[PDB]
Design a binder for this molecule. Structure first.
Ligand SMILES: *C[C@@](*)(O)[C@H](CCCNC(N)=[NH2+])NC(=O)[C@@H]1CCCN1C(=O)[C@H](N)Cc1ccccc1
Ligand SMILES: *C[C@@](*)(O)[C@H](CCCNC(N)=[NH2+])NC(=O)[C@@H]1CCCN1C(=O)[C@H](N)Cc1ccccc1
Lengths: 228, 228
C-alpha cells in the first residue's frame, strides 16, 4: 500500500497473509469462513509452497496472537489467464479451521455491485514505495473511492473487463502495490474487491484495478459448496 | 475394453471420445449436458491439447454424424493425486454446445449408490488386448456386475477408497483397459462410474476400479453451477 497509514487495532479482522518457504509475505488474502480464504489467482504462481497467517500480536485488546495455517486445497478460477488478468480470483481451503475472535473474523460477501464514489478500505503488507522497495513492519490501510467505469476504462483502454473495477486516485500518490494482491477491498462493510493489478503503483491516471467480487458471488458460493 | 462386443447402434448415446493433436483417441468421456462432459482427471495429463468427439456415422437409423468440439474450460477435481488415483474425475466445458438427437444424448446422474450384483454397461475405444496393443475400429461394449466392496478391497489391499468401487470379473478375461479411462459405467440407466484404473487389464482377481460417481454428485452439480 502506497501512501497509507498503520491500520488501527482491530480494523481489518478479515485480513490474511500468504507466506512462502522463506517465511516471507508475498500476497494478501481475505477470510471468508473458518476453512476458506479468498485471494488472487496470480499469487498462486508467485510461490511453490505457502501457508496462511491470520491474527495479530496486539494482545492488549484481545488475546490469541497470529495463527499460521496450512493449505489443503487450492482452487483457482479455471478461466484465469495472465494475458488479461481477468478472473484473477482463487479460493483456498485450510487443513485446520481458523479460531475466530473479535479481531479475527470473516468478511461479508457483497449483495450489490460497488457504487461510484463509495469509500473503501484497502489493506496489505505489500510495497509502500512508488519507485523502489520499502515493505512495512505493520499492516497498512488505505481509504479510497470507487471510480466510475468510464474513468477506469479511460485509464486502461481496452484492458478493463466487466469483471474489473477501479478504486483509487487519478492524481496518484495512493494505491495498492506489489505484495498486496489478493487483499481485501471493503466498502461499507461488504467485500467488493480483491487487489489484482495496475500499471506501476500510485502513478498518475493509473489507479489500481480490482477483481469485482460481486460478479463472482455465485462462483465462490458454489465452489465452496462443491468442495464441502 | 477387453473381451467385449461391438456396441449396437444407439446403445451408448452419451459416449464421448477425447482426441489428441494427432487426431488419435486417448480417453473416453460421458455427456452430462450440452456444454459439459465428464471424464477422468488422469486423462488431463495424457495429452497437451485435445478436443471431444461425440456422435456416430450410422446415418441409416439417424442422421447427424460425428461432431468434434473444442474444450473451453477444463475443471479437474483439485483433490486428485496420482499417488492414490482418488478423485479421478474432471468436468470439461465445450466452446460450442452439442446438438442432441436420439443417438447423442446426456447420461443421468445417480440418485442412489451402486448395488452389488447389479449389471452395468461399460464402453470405450481403448485397448482390447490383455497383453499387447490392439485397438478397435468400432466402439466396444461390456456388461459386467458390480462387485461387493469386500471383494474389491480384497483385490487391491489398502488401495481402495470410499470414492472407488469395483466392477468386472474376478476370473479375468473381461475388463476395461488403457484408453477407456473417463468412459461411462451405466447401471440400470444411471451413471454410476467413470473408468479409472486397475492392475493390468482383465487379469485374474484384478477387476477394474472405477470412480464412484454417486459420491461426486454434489461436486459435479455445484461445479457446473459455479461455472454457469
Ligand atoms: C500480485 C499482486 O501483488 C500485484 C498487485 C499490483 C497492484 N498495483 C496497483 N497499482 N494497484 N499484481 C501484479 O503484480 C499483477 C500480476 C502480474 C502483473 N501484474 C501487474 O500489476 C502488472 N504490472 C500489470 C501490467 C501492466 C502493463 C503491462 C503488463 C502488465
Ligand atoms: C487413463 C485410463 O485409460 C486407464 C484405465 C485403465 C483401466 N484398467 C482396468 N484394468 N480396468 N487408467 C490408467 O492407466 C491409470 C492411471 C495411470 C495409472 N493407471 C493404472 O491403471 C495403473 N496401471 C495402476 C497401477 C497399479 C499398480 C501400480 C501403479 C499403478
Amino acid at each position: 500500500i502506497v501512501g497509507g497509514y498503520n491500520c488501527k487495532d482491530g480494523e481489518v479482522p478479515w485480513q490474511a497473509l500468504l507466506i512462502n518457504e522463506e517465511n516471507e509475505g508475498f500476497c494478501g488474502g481475505t477470510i471468508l469462513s473458518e476453512f476458506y480464504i479468498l485471494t488472487a489467482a496470480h499469487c498462486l504462481y508467485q510461490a511453490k509452497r505457502f501457508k496462511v497467517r491470520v491474527g495479530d500480536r496486539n494482545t492488549e485488546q484481545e488475546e490469541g496472537g497470529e495463527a499460521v495455517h496450512e493449505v489443503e486445497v487450492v482452487i483457482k478460477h479455471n478461466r484465469f489467464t495472465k494475458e488479461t488478468y481477468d478472473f484473477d480470483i482463487a479460493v483456498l481451503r485450510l487443513k485446520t479451521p481458523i479460531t475466530f475472535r473479535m479481531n479475527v473474523a470473516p468478511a461479508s460477501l457483497p449483495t450489490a455491485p460497488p457504487a461510484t464514489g463509495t469509500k473503501c478500505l484497502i489493506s496489505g503488507w505489500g510495497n509502500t514505495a512508488s519507485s523502489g522497495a520499502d515493505y512495512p513492519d505493520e499492516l497498512q490501510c488505505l481509504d479510497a473511492p470507487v471510480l466510475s467505469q468510464a474513468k477506469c476504462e479511460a485509464s486502461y483502454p481496452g484492458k478493463i473487463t466487466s469483471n474489473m473495477f477501479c478504486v483509487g486516485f487519478l492524481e496518484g500518490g495512493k494505491d495498492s502495490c506489489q505484495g498486496d494482491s489478493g487483499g481485501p477491498v471493503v466498502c461499507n462493510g461488504q467485500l467488493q474487491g480483491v487487489v489484482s493489478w495496475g500499471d506501476g503503483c500510485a502513478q498518475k491516471n493509473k489507479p489500481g484495478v480490482y477483481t469485482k467480487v460481486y460478479n463472482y458471488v455465485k462462483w465462490i458460493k458454489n465452489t465452496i459448496a462443491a468442495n464441502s
